[PDB]
């Protein structure tokens with residue numbers, strides 16, 4: 172994630188969940204990478220609950 | 221490439237018992253000399269196996 | 271066996287909570303675990319008395 | 320990105336591989352992302368190949384499978400203890416006795 176933090180100019184953790192600064196020591200399992208494009212302010216619609 | 225078979229004999233399936241079959245390890249954790257209860261897929265005892 | 275309870279958290283180990291959750295809410299989660307185990311200890315003490 | 324945690328072994332980890340195993344020392348460790356502190360000794364337990372880590376009655380980690388080394392290296396079996404003080408009243412004397 173260290174190179175990925177500067178590869179793209181993405182928003183820096185506007186979400187709730189795992190610790191952002193401690194992400195090096197996370198041995199997660201079975202990710203699901205889904206990519207799609209939306210319009211306008213629909214980013215806030217993608218939230219748990 | 222496949223060959224059709226016409227020598228099959230008609231016979232309805234039979235049913236027998238499953239007294240003490242269908243138990244496995246639900247997790248790979250090592251527990252010794254203890255009793256544990258887990259919620260997982262399990263074949264019921266004395267079920268009706270074909 | 272009461273140590274294996276989660277009390278509404280995501281894990282039964284405080285180390286995982288400390289190393290996997292943001293400290294502003296990890297403090298609240300640790301406080302919830304502390305007060306749940308304190309309630310269990312109080313119940314055990316009342317039974318012992 | 321979903322970061323769910325499963326009992327299956329992690330196929331991805333951070334690049335923090337260094338040091339070496341130290342035996343018979345009550346030292347801290349962060350094996351497989353689980354922080355703990357205890358001695359690293361051996362035992363006579365027979366471990367199946369699919370088994371990675373074990374648990375006790377209280378669901379506390381007491382076993383691990385070290386990658387590329389393949390032994391037990393039991394988790395936090397380290398000892399502990401308490402302290403007790405034996406002394407008479409302050410009017411008589413002030414000597415103390417320590418007890419474990």
Ligand SMILES: *[C@@H]1O[C@H](CO)[C@@H](O)[C@H](O)[C@H]1NC(C)=O
Nearest residue numbers: 234235236237266267268269
């Ligand atoms: C199994 O099912 C068959 C028909 O579905 C039935 O005749 C038989 O009695 C059943 N056996 C048991 C043990 O339920």
